[PDB]
């Protein structure tokens, strides 16, 4: 079950400029990292100067 | 925000066996341990004999 509610909080926050789109991950390790934006705003908010959304959360894959 | 999502999972996850009361948890370590059952029903468990609904997930408090 804890990979459901992984799934779950996942599909329910979709990135947070453009308010459409989900966001971007990796798996790094055992980790889940879930980042701030898709990968589309990200790259634009690099090109754009912009780094006030920049960040991400970790979630473990284990339990 | 990870720590109001921790928080909004664990308000909508009851304790599986009575489906009322809200889980037991610990804070082990730097690991947040969420029981599948509320205290009660948990040595309710162990003194009827059944452990099918033993366990938990763990999440942890960083990012
Ligand atoms: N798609 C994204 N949305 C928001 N922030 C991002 C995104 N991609 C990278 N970042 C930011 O880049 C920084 C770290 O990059 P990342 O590759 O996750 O870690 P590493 O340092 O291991 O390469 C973090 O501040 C992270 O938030
Ligand atoms: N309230 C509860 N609900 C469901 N399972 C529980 C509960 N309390 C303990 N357990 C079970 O007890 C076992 C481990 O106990 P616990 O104290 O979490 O770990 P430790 O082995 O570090 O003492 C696990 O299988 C756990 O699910
Ligand atoms: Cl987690
Ligand atoms: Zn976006
Ligand atoms: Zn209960």
Redesign the interface.
């Known amino acids: 079950?804890?990979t459901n509610?992984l799934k779950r909080?996942y599909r329910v926050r979709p990135c947070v400029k453009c308010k459409v789109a989900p966001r971007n991950w990796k798996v790094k390790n055992k980790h889940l990292?879930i980042y701030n934006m898709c990968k589309t705003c990200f790259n634009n908010s690099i090109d754009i100067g912009d780094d006030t959304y920049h960040g991400?959360?970790?979630?473990?894959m284990?339990?």
Chains 1, 2 share one sequence.
């Open positions: 079950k804890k509610w909080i990292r991400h959360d970790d979630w473990l284990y339990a």
